């Protein structure tokens, strides 16, 4: 993979009538190149235009630094490979359509030709008319799903190559985009081919293009806690997260959601981490040490969960 | 529209109501289990 | 005229579908108008923040801030609930007590 | 509200739904307004051996 | 075996299955044979009181 | 021998990859008939355009 790797008046009436189906041509012509120009300028343009800034300003300073640092260099590194996996995919996508779009125009004029010049005749315009129209069934479904299939990769644009998105609850990687499908790579690195057409039907989620994430820690507390203990708990987490300000932001709540018979208090503890959740890895390492540090607290203030007493009756 | 808020108000809610069972001696209990022994 | 008026024709036949769709979409968000940027909205039981709207699609915030695009073809079909819109909500809080409670 | 295209609830806890017609047309709607006095259930159970 | 109508695959046990391509169509299709290295968990549990 | 029998074996496991082209063949010819029918009909002149 890319990423996640370890009778000269008839003569002249037909001549004059060439001339003018081939000024047609150039006309379509000029205009499938214009449409291909803005569509492949504007996806990359419009968007990522600071990206490739980002990624030219870190190289200028590693060239002159050679007149956590490797950390910082591979990641210099990666970004720019990313960048250039983007482009080069979408330059491939447009050729794609290039292809497609110059099949058809070209097989039109044929047509347009043969029908003005007055070439075909009767029974050949009945015959090509047939033949448009079984056609227009035939490959009814397929320009169908490619037109959708550009709506969604040009137009609606919910991901780049790279970005790690959520699908169906799903967090994968996207490894390479197509007309007709796109590929991505599973939390275990499987390899998914998924079609477009299903695709553009999903609420899709990407992290890459998120503000900094939060998350949740839900725990369960005897109903006997005093409410003392509850606040203790409270300030307690508030110092934790204060003297880690690189992984968490102040702001911070903590819920209390429900009473269970007369035994248990459920609860939740929501905060902010500093990051996206890109890198998926150090999301679950800083949520791994925040966790640890509320068992910690709870050990210290003597925090505990019972079961309720049950009443045995002896018979002999 | 402010959730957190809304959170917050419910919390305090819900201790009270904690607080109030407490007061009053309300209480949940499991049925009685009879047991036979035959050693 | 008469074949530019028959490709046109061809042209419906083949792609009017995701025209209809993309018609579909306008109408969800300047006449139906559910929501504006900034409101929470739920959809299927997710509390979600509106960041942008546009014709084919919406962007929503999830709870943890993930960033989610709905496909407007897709949300024109479902029921949208809108807390900014909403009057004073209300609650409840369920519980339980010994059968012999006084 | 009541629309053309779509129709305005409130849930039980007021938040305030639109619902499109071209759904609400095809599912079965209970109206309590209309209804006659209406019935109801309290189920519950006793031991077997209760005479 | 690959045709142009249906796809013949074995199940983990062998058997022999036959799905129409218009079905796979619509699909999300793994691929092991073309994946890189693989990743995998081990889920455990340990007790409140380990330190 | 041994020679000879892997050699059988690899054919087989490089044409079994090949098997919907060989479809995809009969059917593009079948069509491809049909079509100069039609040709040799109409370029002879022999059909008539009520036909
Ligand atoms: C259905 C008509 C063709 C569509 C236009 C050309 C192909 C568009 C791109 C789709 C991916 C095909 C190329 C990559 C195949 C591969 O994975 O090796
Ligand atoms: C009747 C349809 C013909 C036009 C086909 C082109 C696609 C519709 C217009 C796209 C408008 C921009 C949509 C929002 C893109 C975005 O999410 O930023
Ligand atoms: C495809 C055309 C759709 C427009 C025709 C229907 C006219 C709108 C129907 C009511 C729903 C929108 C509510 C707007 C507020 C109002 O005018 O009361
Ligand atoms: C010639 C038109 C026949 C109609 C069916 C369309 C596909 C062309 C025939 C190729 C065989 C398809 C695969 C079937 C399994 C097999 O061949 O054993």
Same mark, same amino acid.
């Given at each position: 993979?890319?990423?996640?790797?370890?009778?000269?008046?008839?003569?002249?009436?037909?001549?004059?009538?060439?001339?003018?189906?081939?000024? =047609?041509?150039?006309?379509?012509?000029?205009?499938? @190149? #214009?449409? /291909?120009?803005? $569509?492949? !300028? +504007?996806?990359?343009?419009?968007?990522?235009?600071?990206?490739?800034?980002?990624?030219?300003?870190?190289?200028?300073?590693?060239?002159?630094?050679?007149?956590?640092?490797?950390?910082?260099?591979?990641?210099?590194?990666?970004?720019?490979?990313?960048?250039?996996?983007?482009?080069?995919?979408?330059?491939?996508?447009?050729?794609?359509?290039?292809?497609?779009?110059?099949?058809?125009?070209?097989?039109?004029?044929?047509? =347009?030709?043969?029908?003005?010049?007055?070439?075909? @005749? #009767?029974? /050949?315009?009945? $015959?090509? !008319? +047939?033949?448009?129209?079984?056609?227009?069934?035939?490959?009814?479904?397929?320009?169908?799903?490619?037109?959708?299939?550009?709506?969604?990769?040009?137009?609606?644009?919910?991901?780049?190559?790279?970005?790690?998105?959520?699908?169906?609850?799903?967090?994968?990687?996207?490894?390479?985009?197509?007309?007709?499908?796109?590929?991505?790579?599973?939390?275990?690195?499987?390899?998914?081919?998924?079609?477009?057409?299903?695709?553009?039907?999903?609420?899709?989620?990407?992290?890459?293009?998120?503000?900094?994430?939060?998350?949740?820690?839900?725990?369960?507390?005897?109903?006997?806690?005093?409410?003392?203990?509850?606040?203790?708990?409270?300030?307690?987490?508030?110092?934790?997260?204060?003297?880690?300000?690189?992984?968490?932001?102040?702001?911070?709540?903590?819920?209390?959601?429900?009473?269970?018979?007369?035994?248990?208090?459920?609860?939740?503890?929501?905060?902010?981490?500093?990051?996206?959740?890109?890198?998926?890895?150090?999301?679950?390492?800083?949520?791994?040490?925040?966790?640890?540090?509320?068992?910690?607290?709870?050990?210290?203030?003597?925090?505990?969960?019972?079961?309720?007493?049950?009443?045995?009756?002896?018979?002999?």
């Amino acid at each position: 993979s890319r990423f996640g790797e370890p009778q000269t008046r008839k003569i002249l009436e037909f001549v004059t009538w060439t001339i003018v189906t081939v000024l =047609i041509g150039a006309f379509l012509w000029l205009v499938k @190149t #214009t449409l /291909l120009k803005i $569509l492949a !300028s +504007s996806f990359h343009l419009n968007r990522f235009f600071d990206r490739i800034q980002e990624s030219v300003f870190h190289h200028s300073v590693l060239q002159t630094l050679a007149g956590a640092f490797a950390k910082w260099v591979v990641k210099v590194y990666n970004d720019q490979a990313a960048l250039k996996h983007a482009l080069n995919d979408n330059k491939t996508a447009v050729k794609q359509l290039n292809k497609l779009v110059t099949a058809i125009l070209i097989v039109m004029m044929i047509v =347009i030709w043969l029908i003005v010049t007055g070439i075909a @005749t #009767t029974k /050949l315009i009945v $015959l090509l !008319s +047939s033949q448009l129209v079984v056609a227009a069934f035939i490959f009814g479904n397929t320009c169908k799903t490619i037109f959708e299939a550009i709506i969604f990769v040009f137009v609606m644009h919910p991901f780049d190559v790279g970005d790690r998105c959520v699908i169906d609850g799903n967090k994968m990687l996207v490894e390479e985009m197509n007309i007709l499908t796109t590929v991505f790579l599973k939390w275990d690195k499987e390899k998914v081919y998924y079609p477009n057409s299903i695709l553009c039907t999903k609420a899709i989620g990407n992290f890459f293009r998120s503000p900094d994430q939060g998350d949740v820690l839900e725990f369960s507390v005897d109903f006997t806690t005093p409410v003392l203990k509850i606040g203790d708990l409270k300030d307690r987490i508030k110092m934790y997260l204060e003297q880690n300000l690189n992984f968490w932001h102040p702001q911070h709540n903590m819920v209390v959601k429900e009473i269970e018979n007369v035994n248990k208090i459920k609860m939740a503890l929501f905060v902010n981490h500093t990051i996206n959740f890109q890198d998926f890895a150090e999301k679950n390492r800083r949520r791994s040490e925040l966790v640890l540090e509320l068992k910690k607290i709870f050990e210290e203030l003597d925090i505990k969960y019972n079961l309720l007493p049950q009443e045995i009756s002896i018979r002999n």
